[PDB]
Structure formats: structure tokens, C-alpha cells
């Protein structure tokens, strides 16, 4: 599908509300495998299970190992811009 830009809003007491799988060391994109109901990704409306996370706040995640992606994603705060695509 088309590449989309998605805005997520989160407070500092919460996580993103997603589960991710994959990573460069597995030859697979960083994929959203779960969206936890009521948490920031669900509330933002624009992220879905099966989306590939291509970038977050301008940081490219297309060539990123799993734990690299976890550190990068968990460091973002507040108003967070995602670049995603559903394949």
C-alpha cells in the first residue's frame, strides 16, 4: 500500500501500545504485530497490525536490528511521527 505518515500522542507514563516483531538480522521489516486496546497507538487511529514501521521521528528503521528498533522506538516522547506502510 501507500506510505503513510501517522501522528501518535503519548504521555510519559505510557508505552506506545504496540508489539513489534522482525528486524534486519531476521531479513524481515519491523512489523506491528499487536496494538494494545486503549493505549496510544490504538488511540491515534492510524496504526494497524501488519504495518511496517519505516521511520520514527525521522529515524530510519528499514535497516535496523530488532533490539536497535526497540531502543529507538522506546526513546521517543510526546508527539511522535511514524512513517508506515501496509504490505
Amino acid at each position: 500500500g501507500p506510505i503513510r505518515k501517522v501522528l501518535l500522542l503519548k504521555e510519559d507514563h505510557e508505552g506506545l501500545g504496540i508489539s513489534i516483531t522482525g528486524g534486519k538480522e531476521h531479513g524481515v521489516p519491523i512489523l506491528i504485530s499487536e496494538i494494545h486496546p486503549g493505549q496510544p497507538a490504538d488511540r491515534c487511529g492510524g496504526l494497524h497490525v501488519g504495518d511496517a514501521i519505516l521511520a520514527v521521528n525521522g529515524v530510519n528503521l528499514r535497516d535496523t536490528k530488532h533490539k536497535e528498533a526497540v531502543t529507538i522506538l522506546s526513546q521517543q516522547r510526546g508527539e511522535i511521527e511514524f512513517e508506515v506502510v501496509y504490505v
Binding site: 508505552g15 506506545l16 504496540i18 508489539s19 513489534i20 516483531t21 522482525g22 528486524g23 531476521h26 524481515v28 504485530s33 499487536e34 494494545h36 530488532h66 533490539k67 526497540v70 522506538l73 522506546s74
Partner: peptide, 8 residues
């Protein structure tokens, strides 16, 4: 089982 999953 080969792919990792992290809750974030």
C-alpha cells in the same frame, strides 16, 4: 518461534 516479539 524464529522471530522475536517485543512489547513497547
Amino acid at each position: 518461534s524464529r522471530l522475536p516479539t517485543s512489547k513497547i
